[PDB]
Amino acid sequence: PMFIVNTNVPRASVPEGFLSELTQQLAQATGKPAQYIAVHVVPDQLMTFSGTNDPCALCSLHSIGKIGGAQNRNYSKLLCGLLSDRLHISPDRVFINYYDMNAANVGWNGSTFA
Amino acid sequence: PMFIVNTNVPRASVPEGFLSELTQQLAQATGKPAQYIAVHVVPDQLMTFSGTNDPCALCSLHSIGKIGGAQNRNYSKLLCGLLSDRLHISPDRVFINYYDMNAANVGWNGSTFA
Amino acid sequence: PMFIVNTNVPRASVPEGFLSELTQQLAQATGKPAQYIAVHVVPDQLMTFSGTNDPCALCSLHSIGKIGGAQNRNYSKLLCGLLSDRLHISPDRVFINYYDMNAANVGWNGSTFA
């Protein structure tokens, strides 16, 4: 799995250890080894949400499997709470897009996962 | 919905008010409330389009519904027009990827929209 | 086609000519003219792969067709070889997501490809 967070919160406000934290939380939540987990955090972005520039975030979670109705509900509870706790972003100014990737459309190590 | 513009135009060329303007235009074209519209502009990027580094942009528009054959042409006409008029990017150096998102794959405020 | 590379490799380590090389190699592998290829490279990112901050990359290739299990394996071999030679990123620290786009979902030049 790969998790991207794009946010207008400044780089100084991202807690040292945030990426390692997310890695760990995503391993437990998706039941996937931390070895295949990639996390990418992009602060200081020029963005608006509802027309304003208060703290917001636009996130994507791509995974091979483990995506769907119930699971995405669980992920949204977990991830909005982590962004609210550590970045101080209201949960109503977060969007998370979930992508179920086919294993043939994920390249890794010079091949794909199918 | 969410609209992301990645461009090699410098930050000082983005006009004051541009994200607010995009927010209102997208509210009117999609017919969704402005409250659920997020806009993200990424200037100063390192990019080429057709093998050259003239001004260009790579954009994405993600919405739950209101995405389709005819609608995507109207969005393209509106958005390439605004990019050309505001950022001075020619319409033939703009790509816009359109995504119809299922409500169960969009997380917001700790739940999904399903 | 459009190819995006996000990486934690510093900007100074991306060699002059890399975007043109990527254009040329994409055009040959996919058979699309260089005119419709856009390349976007984003260095200096805050990202972890497998929980560590060694050199890594998260890439996406979007194309209207020419995406498939066997084609994707060939793209992966070429692209990871290019990343490895030019940016010194190990191939097991690269993910590449592949997207086959419908023509109606790609805007270009004030309209769509449909």
From Swiss-Prot, chains A, B, C:
Alphabetical UniProt keywords: Acetylation, Cytokine, Cytoplasm, Immunity, Inflammatory response, Innate immunity, Isomerase, Secreted
Source superkingdom: Eukaryota
Any one GO molecular-function label of the UniProt entry: protease binding
N6-acetyllysine PTM positions: 77
Record's signal peptide: none
GO biological process: cell surface receptor signaling pathway; cellular senescence; DNA damage response, signal transduction by p53 class mediator; inflammatory response; innate immune response; negative regulation of apoptotic process; negative regulation of cellular senescence; negative regulation of DNA damage response, signal transduction by p53 class mediator
Reported effect, residue 1 to G: Loss of tautomerase activity, reduced activation of intracellular signaling pathways, and reduced interaction with CXCR2 and COPS5
Enzyme Commission code: 5.3.2.1, 5.3.3.12
Residues bearing the modification N6-succinyllysine: 77
Keyword Nucleus annotated: no
Subcellular location: Secreted; Cytoplasm
Pfam families per record: MIF (PF01187)
Free-text function comment from the UniProt entry: Pro-inflammatory cytokine involved in the innate immune response to bacterial pathogens. The expression of MIF at sites of inflammation suggests a role as mediator in regulating the function of macrophages in host defense. Counteracts the anti-inflammatory activity of glucocorticoids. Has phenylpyruvate tautomerase and dopachrome tautomerase activity (in vitro), but the physiological substrate is not known. It is not clear whether the tautomerase activity has any physiological relevance, and whether it is important for cytokine activity.
Family: Belongs to the MIF family.
Protein name per Swiss-Prot or TrEMBL: Macrophage migration inhibitory factor
